[PDB]
Specification:
monomer, 446 residues, mainly alpha, Lysozyme, three-stranded antiparallel β-sheet, 3 strands, 75% helix, binds the ligand CCOC(=O)N1CCC[C@H](N2CCC(C(=O)NC3(C)CCC3)CC2)CC1, binds oleic acid, membrane
Length: 446
């Protein structure tokens, strides 16, 4: 290799390493330095940042020395240990994306029953096991394959995994580290998106009908409440209500909360109501029969009158599961419920009639930073790891088809995932972008 090429690769690969080290350090420090970022899902973001910091600092720079020198001059032990660090960190990154996806999946689908398991202690447990499973998966086969075969077939001046020499084995590892994780995460995301728009529609429906209060108030019974009828305490103390609010939110609210904190509290309530419906023998068959829109109209009724109240509408409930909506609408209107809240009752009854949201005027689903970040990091993994996995795919159908130059470039693209991951957080999350900016400006000063 020419000296002109040596300096150029060193500068470009060196700046890439610098951009990767900085970005993942900013991500780790942002979570450390900012309280608003100290959340359960960001424990996984920090864990992912640690894996990407190893890729940037170690893997990238060692790969550069290997390319520039044209051979491996550090010995077989140094080779096998460096391969172990590289594969274990790359797999720990994939396993961390799986932890982010699953946590986000359960927190949206099961907000009540999962956010009782969703502690920083359980995040740390899942993180450690992800790093341990990653090590136990790659490191023993990297170091001991030569001993099971009876020969080290990797030549001196060469560094690669011996068991990956056959393309089908490499394809097997690609199925387990790319194809299956990606299919699992895409399926998890489509469920997360569908649930989010479903839950947002129930929130906007009840916001119109019941009303949203961002400050502590008293309900009809005189108990302290917040949001869309979220009971804080039965205790006749405002400080007891404020303390129960801070325990539920995770911050010193002082009796005032945001719409998103009021939506999170409402989604636990939807889960509590849906648990009741499925446990009630009179509401369970009708709810199972109904579609997503009519399910929300039943939830609306439950939120207003209670479990037994809605169960009192025996003939309307029968007509709704028989798909005779015009008939069900007649019986629902001839009630004390319609007489008290005519505007709200008509809107609910129309929802049961049409099966649409026409009685209300709903906006498209507001994609929150969490959903957007998840989609961005998933697309970042698919984009940067696709070239290498296509190269693996074609190598199974054609022996030595893939040029050495292409393996080299596809490996570099895998590494680029570690560079673009902190960018996904900065583009999607305002709090990350401002903390990254704050930290960079603070470092520039002094
Ligand atoms: C999920 C497990 O991970 C993978 O399936 N991966 C797919 C792409 C290949 C990638 N690396 C790229 C650098 C290569 C290299 O020569 N590294 C040294 C300079 C010699 C030892 C250090 C080794 C292979 C690792 C990540
Ligand atoms: C050489 C060091 C580079 C490392 C920087 C850290 C990576 C994070 C930065 C990239 C994200 C870009 C931020 C711009 C936000 C624009 C928001 C938008 O319009 O959606
Ligand atoms: C956080 C993970 C650890 C980061 C440590 C980074 C060190 C790895 C970088 C590679 C360059 C150093 C390798 C020296 C090889 C040259 C010696 C020789 O010519 O034989
Ligand atoms: C209760 C399920 C057991 C979870 C054990 C997870 C093993 C560690 C590896 C991490 C990545 C694997 C996929 C993520 C599963 C997490 C699901 C959960 O939150 O329980
Ligand atoms: C993502 C999974 C792909 C990784 C492939 C590895 C599969 C696991 C099997 C490995 C068998 C080798 C274990 C090493 C045994 C050590 C023997 C000894 O004591 O010398
Ligand atoms: C995200 C979906 C992307 C679709 C994947 C299809 C595009 C393939 C990607 C390009 C890089 C692969 C390079 C293949 C080189 C092997 C051919 C050869 O023998 O020279
Ligand atoms: C990540 C930003 C870096 C900027 C992109 C430019 C660097 C990538 C390209 C350089 C590698 C060389 C590719 C051309 C093939 C040369 C063939 C050969 O080496 O035999
Ligand atoms: C300061 C660093 C300058 C940036 C590098 C320039 C990158 C431009 C993009 C195209 C890829 C260049 C690859 C060179 C091919 C030469 C082929 C060879 O002889 O190996
Ligand atoms: C021309 C297609 C572009 C493919 C993108 C590959 C990613 C490049 C990013 C990192 C820069 C590393 C410098 C290139 C190393 C030289 C390898 C070689 O061509 O022999
Ligand atoms: C609120 C604070 C956030 C704390 C989150 C802690 C998560 C744990 C992080 C991962 C550590 C994984 C181990 C990394 C190995 C590095 C070893 C090395 O330097 O080679
Ligand atoms: C986990 C802690 C790791 C500690 C770092 C150890 C660094 C490894 C040092 C180099 C030893 C190289 C082994 C020599 C094998 C020669 C084989 C050959 O050249 O074919
Ligand atoms: C025991 C289950 C009964 C269902 C609760 C509904 C009680 C009806 C009366 C009060 C209206 C309050 C406003 C709506 C929010 C209620 C939240 C909830 O308790 O799930």
């Amino acid at each position: 290799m020419e000296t002109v090429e040596m300096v150029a690769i060193a500068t470009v690969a060196g700046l890439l390493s610098l951009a990767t080290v900085t970005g993942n350090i900013l991500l780790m420090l942002s979570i450390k330095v900012n309280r608003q970022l100290q959340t359960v899902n960001n424990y996984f973001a920090f864990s992912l940042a640690c894996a990407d910091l190893i890729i940037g600092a170690f893997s990238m720079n060692l790969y550069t020395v290997y390319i520039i020198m044209g051979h491996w001059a550090l010995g077989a032990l140094a080779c096998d240990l460096a391969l172990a660090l590289d594969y274990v960190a790359s797999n720990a990154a994939v396993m961390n994306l799986l932890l982010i996806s699953f946590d986000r999946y359960f927190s949206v689908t099961r907000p009540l029953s999962y956010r009782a398991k969703r502690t920083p202690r359980r995040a740390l447990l899942m993180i450690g096991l992800a790093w341990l499973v990653s090590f136990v998966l790659w490191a023993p086969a990297i170091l001991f394959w030569q001993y099971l075969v009876g020969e080290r077939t990797v030549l001196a001046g060469q560094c690669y995994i011996q068991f990956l020499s056959q393309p089908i084995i490499t394809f097997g590892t690609a199925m387990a580290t790319f194809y299956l994780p990606v299919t699992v995460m895409c399926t998890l995301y489509w469920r997360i998106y569908r649930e989010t728009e479903n839950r947002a529609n129930i929130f906007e429906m009840l916001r119109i009908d019941e009303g949203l209060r961002l400050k502590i108030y008293k309900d009809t019974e005189g108990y302290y409440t917040i949001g869309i009828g979220h009971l804080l305490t039965k205790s006749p103390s405002l400080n007891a209500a404020k303390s129960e609010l801070d325990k539920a939110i995770g911050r010193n609210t002082n009796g005032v909360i945001t719409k998103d904190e009021a939506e999170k509290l409402f989604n636990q309530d939807v889960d509590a109501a849906v648990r009741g419906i499925l446990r009630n023998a009179k509401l369970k068959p009708v709810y199972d029969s109904l579609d997503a829109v009519r399910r929300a109209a039943l939830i609306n009724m439950v939120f207003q009158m209670g479990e037994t109240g809605v169960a009192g509408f025996t003939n309307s409930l029968r007509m709704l599961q028989q798909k005779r909506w015009d008939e069900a609408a007649v019986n629902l209107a001839k009630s004390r419920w319609y007489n008290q809240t005519p505007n709200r009752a008509k809107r609910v009854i129309t929802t049961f009639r049409t099966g649409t949201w026409d009685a209300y005027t709903f906006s498209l689903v507001k994609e929150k930073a969490a959903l957007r970040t998840l989609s961005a990091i998933l697309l970042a993994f698919i984009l940067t790891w696709t070239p290498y996995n296509i190269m693996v795919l074609v190598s199974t159908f054609c022996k030595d088809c893939v040029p050495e130059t292409l393996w080299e470039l596809g490996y570099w693209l895998c590494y680029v995932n570690a560079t673009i991951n902190p960018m996904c957080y900065a583009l999607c999350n305002k709090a990350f972008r401002d903390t990254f900016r704050l930290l960079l400006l603070a470092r520039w000063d002094h």
